[model samples]
Target: EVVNIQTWINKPDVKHHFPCKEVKESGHMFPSHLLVTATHMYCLREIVSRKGLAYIQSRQALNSVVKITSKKKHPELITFKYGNSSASGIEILAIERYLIPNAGDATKAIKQQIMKVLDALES
Candidate 1:
């Protein structure tokens, strides 16, 4: 399926778009994104708004710009830290079935790709 992250982007087009899940204080599952444009990065938390999705925040994809941490748990727990601090990243849950259609082919390895790229950010 054709999805769009351009809703919150100001660039010509986005390059990498990674899918993942976010957990709220109430233990709710909020599907999120890790997309990078020409030079910037965004960690968009897909929240429900009326009848559409809402994005969360943006950041620079510079190397080591964010800190990573993993929590010892059942579904697993990993979070991102940058531009200040703290939260679970998407890799924790392999995202068996993502929000969009025909995503299995891509997200099946969501854990690995999301981990490596985001783990290293960019130079």
Candidate 2:
């Protein structure tokens, strides 16, 4: 018997918001997705190693896949606006309205999915 484990976030429900200057000033802006993405990348590297593949080459290939997908579907998600250091309160409001409300649960779900994949592979 073979078992496959999978976990995912509902993209439609995730409220995406840009990190505003105010949030960055408050030191509250963390790229939480990067943590989840890194976990997957580490797992991918391990899988490639088992097949005697070069990690660097594998990672580059993976990056291209992710980058292309993100660019095609969510250009804003990958872009950051830069300007004066001063925080406009509007950015903070937007974060509260969008990102903050969704961040906690999203992080939890990402971690859970990563663990599930790891466990399945181990077994």
Candidate 3:
């Protein structure tokens, strides 16, 4: 049997599922899914090397998601702003690209889903 990615996120309710790449600050692209549930968001990564491999690359508490930015200036890049419990105050992760066989053009789909969750959390 094949394994599902979000198994590490403890079986998400999966409010949103997205296909994109996470851009490491060192500038590596790990193709991944941006999954949103009621209480958390998960970045599940598929690292290339062998068959059937994936991991929970990042996790964000629902309340920790401060902002998500996708701009016209750089149409293909999406930056995530969030609070982390580590010594680092607020952190940002930049991700983009549509991971598909025929994705010559990019996708704007992820931005909307991410915003929907953020919208629900506004005070």
Candidate 4:
């Protein structure tokens, strides 16, 4: 008996179509981790549209830009961006995942978001 696995491979076509700048940037740097993070975050933030994920202000994209705390800045968290915004680059969505212990508490909602990413990789 043979088991068949249907996997969705990332193709070069996305290089042109998807203007979602943030996703593309993260995809390039940390392929595995970021891919997992984006998939889960988008599912929760966009598809589910959960109020819990709406952390961003300005009545625009909630949770799009998570404010970094003082503790997170030193060594715990790092901000990853796609391109130069002031230099006429587009705003790419980003995910700042915390792995270290007590790297400042990620909101309960955010933690759930991270869990989703982990779950996706398991299978």
| Top TM-score prediction, candidate number | 3
Candidate 4 overall Cα lDDT vs. reference? Answer: 0.29
Question: Please, what are the lDDT tens digits per residue for candidate 2 over residues 1-33?
Answer: 111111112233222221211124465543222
Model 3, range 1-123, lDDT digits (tens) per residue? 234664643464776666677776666777877776766667777757645557777777665655555666565566666664347666545333323321222223434454565585646
Alpha carbon deviation, residue 28, candidate 1 (Å): 2.9
Model 1 ranges with Cα > 4 A deviation: 1-13, 47-52, 60-64, 71-76, 83-123
Off-target runs (Cα >4 Å) in candidate 3 are: 1-3, 6-12, 84-123
Candidate 1, residue 1: Cα displacement in angstroms equals 23
TM-score of 3: 0.59
Worst 10 residues of 1 by lDDT: 89-98
Write one digit per residue (lDDT tens) for candidate 4, span 1-123.
111111111432111111011122344321111112332232111112332222211111223443433343454343332222345645665443332233333333344553454575746
What's each prediction's TM-score? 0.43, 0.22, 0.59, 0.18
Q: Which model, 3 or 4, shows the larger TM-score?
A: 3
Question: Candidate 3 local accuracy as lDDT?
Answer: 0.58
For candidate 2, list the clashing residue pairs, or say none. Answer: none
Better TM-score candidate (1, 3): 3
Better of 1 and 4 by TM-score: 1
